[PDB]
Amino acid sequence: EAQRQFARVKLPARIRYIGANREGVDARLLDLSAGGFAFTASGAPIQPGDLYKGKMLFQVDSISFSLEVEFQVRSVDPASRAVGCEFQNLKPREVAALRYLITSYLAG
């Protein structure tokens, strides 16, 4: 089957996005990679295939990092309700920043 191209890590990050019902959602990430992320479903029902826009926020020590993102929902786990999402249209510098963030956590 398909191969994982980007390592996934747990870290202190959140996604803020506008849901299907036009209500804001502020969800903590289950994990992050340079390709996408996962979070637990809440708010309006979430259907794989749907496109969203939001802001990924990371904070540690005295660092705040935010990235505007677009994402597609790829899957929802029918037990845990983990929503697996794929970033769309990241710029090369954005991918590289995410990779730095990820690898710095993996390394630690």
Ligand X SMILES: Nc1nc2c(ncn2[C@@H]2O[C@@H]3COP(=O)(O)O[C@H]4[C@@H](O)[C@H](n5cnc6c(=O)[nH]c(N)nc65)O[C@@H]4COP(=O)(O)O[C@H]3[C@H]2O)c(=O)[nH]1
Of 5-13, 17-25, 50-58, 63-71: span binding Cl ion (CB under 5 A): 5-13
Q: In Å, what is the CA distance from 57 to each residue of 12, 31, 34, 73? A: 9, 13, 14, 18
* Interface characters, 69-88, with ligand X (x: CB under 6 A): -----xx--------xxx--
Residues in the chain preceding a C-to-N separation beyond 2.5 angstroms (breaks) = none
Residues that bind a second copy (CB under 8 A): 60-69, 91, 93-94, 96-97, 100, 104
Residues that bind Cl ion (CB under 5 A): 7-8
